[PDB]
Design a binder for this molecule. Structure first.
Ligand SMILES: [Fe+3]
Ligand SMILES: [Fe+3]
Ligand SMILES: [Fe+3]
Lengths: 449, 456
């Protein structure tokens, strides 16, 4: 007789151990530099922190830019990308061991085992952000209803360094645009109706777009090897990219992808126009925007949505709508996260100065702040991360390079420091022989003023 | 600091339990019928047997058609196909629960966890079947590839059959998973970001996917081939009639496509398939016309009527001579699998055709057991109407003897015997077969004779 089915279950300490097991593959160890040097097999997952996170407590939207969420997004990107083919720009010779470490039976199996729990952690909040009886007519009404300055335009054009802000923006798209259509290709494997051929026609349109975005990056002094700028990828940028791998890998979510595809096709011309205009205003004639201008909706409605609704019934419509609404939530989070990061980068001189009154407030006992006393040698590079409350970094002796973003750095000497804002991506390196410094966990730095 | 890395490890009883855990998803239970009825989420893995197999003892080529290998091939096909999109021909309505059972976080994770061990079981034998030289260069690769370019074993088996049309239909269904999802394993190698070779690989896939035109799409052409000889094109109607070796051949390309450390093996296999394609399609068209006449639609094959220069050469130049043994290994591994296919298929057709004679061979074999020529273990079975034993094989020969009632003994597609009281059949080792009980009750015996010829 058939043995009983034990349901798949992985939680608590066993899940923590499984996540740590995946992430302690040596290719995921902290980088000694800020950049990956043409090695697409190395991704920084900061495995030393992973034993101390609670993967069972799924965060709501309000806590979705906390560190545990960033850590999970980084994990998921690596798990998903084991299905993608990468070779170094300079060729595979010399990088065979890393190649084999990333593409191994073990690395795939370890990542795939934790993937369900990681996806609940990453995407669970969307259950409460979105709510979806539908018919073809009411779907047509909802779609029709989907049709000024954008938050990204405002953040870049209003920046203290527009070129830096635009470069920080462009690198966010490196995983997506350089592997363009990869998540979409996941939906074209198999055997289904004429919708499969129509989905494949879209994939065919992409002279290859990846190569055009190489030129965009290179025209403003950025490189196009994955993932050079790993440590500068925002939480929300990974979240947006990972969403499409999530939909593409998990075919129970196929109809959500149908919806998201409609929305992306329907938004594509406006996005590309705005991107072209924004980049020209910032960089002038130096920037290559062919990638965006070459891309310049109804076809997805008629050729994909309609036949699927006819073949599979009205029951798929709430899934189609959910895909659109979930994606829109993620775009909002992206707008916020990116805007916050650019403001944080631009305000570094002021936040260096804010150290003094904040430090003085701690002395006067306005906040009772836990403090960590650290002593670190030269080249101890703390890979980028964030904290869930505000912190005060105070240098006692030596010299620290405090990294707040791409092209955004402060040198901090004895007696100096910086206010570190919650959820903002940052790291540090020690530039002197030894650096003695303090981290005060102030929660809200404004309470120290 | 970084905790120590515990290496991924799954073996022994823990591996057995993990395999059973995957395969006890209800969508993998025995079918009550011979055919799946337009439900692409149901695949018969015979989970009741899985606790009793030894997954740690990797078989060599000589034992690669044993039951444990068939069972593992069936598992792997299901694991790989969780990445492929299927909907029923008749639409999804009514099949939503099965859809969600196949495409679930749990079903994927359970299958992916056992996939490394399954792949060692399935493909480990190839380590001893292919040699790995350490002196490859571009010139010696060109010499080898040049040295690759009569009646085939498949042609002989079909044309020499007692029922040619039946043999050709059995042949055609072997390609259903491959041709109906055509280019799916190849698409796995086009995801990501690599050189100009990626675009060239994609240019091959575009031909196989009919440039996004459905009627011109190859899958649709093979639908017509199947339907023109009275077969259906819903996956996987004929699951129970898929040979071990046919699953092995299909799974090999999912193996190479999913595991990008094997990317250069796929480069090699792709070269071999492209260089053999015209000859295969000509022979297939000619063979099918000879068997079926004008009734058969062969457009799929005639439509199919450069990898060296556009894919192999740039990769060798970019990544160096170290990739060449992998390219060669892919070609040689694939050729070994084609040989196994030729053998397995030929053996199955001969087994199907010889059923009347094997029914008669029951008598002298049964008499030899009475005279004690072989000391054979025997299993006494009593089963009710409709107890359908899903297709499988055994590692030694068996004698099935019916004491009372009526059994439909299934040896292949369109190949059946009715066995009554006092009758029976010699069941040849490694040959795919099943049974159903056609009377209210059937009392029968299975004698494990090892080699039936020793009873004569
Ligand atoms: Fe594009
Ligand atoms: Fe920090
Ligand atoms: Fe049997």
């Amino acid at each position: 007789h058939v043995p009983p089915h034990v349901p798949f279950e992985l939680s608590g300490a066993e899940l923590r151990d499984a996540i740590v097991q995946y992430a302690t593959n040596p290719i995921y160890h902290d980088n000694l530099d800020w950049l990956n040097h043409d090695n697409p097999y190395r991704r920084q997952l900061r495995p030393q922190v992973l034993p101390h996170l609670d993967y069972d407590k799924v965060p709501g939207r309000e806590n979705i830019l906390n560190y545990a969420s960033l850590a999970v997004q980084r994990l998921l990107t690596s798990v998903y990308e084991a299905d993608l083919v990468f070779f170094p720009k300079s060729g595979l010779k010399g990088k065979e061991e890393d190649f084999r470490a990333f593409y191994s039976p073990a690395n795939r199996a370890l990542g795939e085992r934790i993937r369900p729990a990681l996806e609940r952690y990453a995407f669970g909040f969307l259950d409460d952000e979105v709510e979806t009886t539908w018919t073809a007519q009411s779907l047509d009404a909802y779609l029709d209803s989907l049709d000024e300055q954008s938050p990204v335009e405002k953040a870049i054009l209003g920046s203290a360094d527009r070129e830096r802000a635009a470069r920080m923006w462009l690198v966010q798209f490196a995983p997506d645009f350089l592997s363009e259509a990869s998540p979409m290709m996941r939906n074209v494997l198999g055997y289904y109706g004429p919708a499969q051929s129509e989905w494949f026609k879209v994939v065919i349109d992409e002279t290859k777009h990846s190569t055009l975005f190489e030129r965009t990056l290179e025209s403003v002094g950025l490189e196009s090897d994955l993932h050079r700028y790993w440590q500068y990828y925002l939480n929300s940028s990974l979240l947006l990219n990972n969403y499409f791998h999530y939909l593409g890998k998990n075919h129970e979510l196929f109809f959500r992808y149908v919806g998201a595809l409609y929305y992306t096709e329907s938004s594509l011309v406006d996005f590309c126009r705005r991107a072209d205009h924004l980049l020209r205003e910032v960089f002038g004639d130096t920037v290559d925007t062919t990638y965006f201008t070459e891309h310049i909706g109804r076809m997805a409605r008629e050729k994909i949505i309609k036949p699927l609704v006819e073949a599979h019934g009205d029951g798929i419509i709430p899934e189609i709508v959910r895909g659109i609404e979930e994606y829109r939530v993620l775009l909002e989070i992206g707008d916020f996260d990116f805007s916050e990061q650019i403001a944080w980068m631009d305000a570094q001189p002021e936040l260096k100065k804010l150290h003094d009154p904040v430090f003085e407030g701690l002395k006067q006992g306005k906040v009772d702040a836990p403090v960590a006393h650290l002593v670190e040698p030269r080249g101890e590079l703390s890979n980028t991360h964030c904290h869930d409350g505000d912190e005060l970094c105070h240098i006692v002796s030596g010299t620290m390079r405090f990294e707040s973003g791409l092209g955004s750095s402060l040198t901090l000497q004895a007696g100096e420091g910086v206010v570190i804002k919650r959820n903002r991506l940052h790291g540090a390196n020690i530039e002197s022989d030894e650096c003695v410094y303090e981290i005060h966990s102030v929660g809200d730095y404004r309470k120290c003023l």
